[PDB]
Design a protein around this ligand. Structure first.
Ligand code: 0VG
Length: 266
């Protein structure tokens, strides 16, 4: 888990700006591995350790792999690089990405979330900005800074918040479950099919709450298939008990994805 600083080489330029994100390379047994490095500016240190503790436990093709942590100039979290970056920024700059391709990527996120649910972790920050692209056809989930391992005896974690991605039970009762992540996943779907547009544009958190409480939901994105909008709305089931889990969500996406693939060949 504790990486050797002399095996780590950071690039001069910054990828983004907790602190900074930098591209680097970590010298392995034989090969060199391209990495993304989260570099911190007591609370921030503990947050990074807890984050690393979560990632260390996760083993799945659709989740970003942590290489390890390094303590030098600053505290550093070293991850397998996902070269194409955040999904929302990518779709913003690539507006001709095909509908089938969007379905493929969100289905991959649901597979990752299915695993996370089975592992009894709640993500708590599941948004398009936190999906990273390895390729145009390969997405992984990242940013486990708010993530929690659920207690053996409870199906929820009791708590700035990303309010526009949060389910009503999160807002009203501070309770976060895998079902709460399903709600965020609906918002993520909406973002993806809207090519990385922000959800609830021009609205305050309080107005979002008021809107949802009135039974209103965001409209169907341009060119988004009815079946995928139907799934979004199902993810936005107000009552947690009646909201689907990720096993059901992933199945719906898997089946629909296979249908569209058959349409393409035909
Ligand atoms: C840095 C972001 C934002 C602007 C563009 N930019 C780009 C661009 C290309 C690739 C990446 N990759 C990665 C970024 C972050 C990360 C970590 C912390 C915060 C944000 C992102 N984590 N990570 C783990 C694996 N791969 C990445 N980011």
């Amino acid at each position: 888990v504790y990486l050797d600083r002399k095996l780590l080489t950071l690039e001069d330029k910054e990828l983004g700006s907790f602190g900074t994100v930098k591209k680097g390379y970590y010298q392995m047994k034989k090969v060199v591995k391209t990495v993304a490095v989260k570099i911190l500016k007591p609370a921030l240190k503990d947050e990074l350790l807890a984050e690393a503790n979560v990632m260390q436990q996760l083993d799945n093709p659709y989740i970003v792999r942590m290489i390890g942590i390094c303590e030098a100039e600053s505290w550093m979290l070293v991850m397998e690089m996902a070269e194409l970056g955040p999904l929302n920024k990518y779709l913003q700059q690539n507006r001709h990405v095909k509908d089938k391709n969007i379905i493929e990527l969100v289905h991959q996120v649901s597979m990752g979330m299915k695993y996370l649910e089975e592992s009894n972790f709640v993500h708590r920050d599941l948004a398009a900005r936190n999906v990273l692209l390895v390729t145009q056809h390969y997405a992984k989930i990242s940013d486990f800074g708010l993530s929690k391992a659920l207690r053996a005896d409870e199906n929820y974690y009791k708590a700035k918040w990303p309010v526009k991605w949060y389910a009503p039970e999160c807002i009203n009762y501070y309770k976060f479950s895998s079902k709460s992540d399903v709600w965020s996943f609906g918002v993520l779907m909406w973002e993806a099919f809207s090519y990385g547009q922000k959800p609830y544009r021009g609205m305050k958190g309080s107005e979002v709450t008021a809107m949802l409480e009135k039974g209103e939901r965001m409209g169907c994105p341009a060119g988004c298939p009815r079946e995928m909008y139907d799934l979004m709305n199902l993810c936005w089931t107000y009552d947690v008990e009646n909201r689907p889990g990720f096993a059901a969500v992933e199945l719906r996406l898997r089946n629909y994805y296979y249908d569209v693939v058959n349409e393409g060949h035909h």
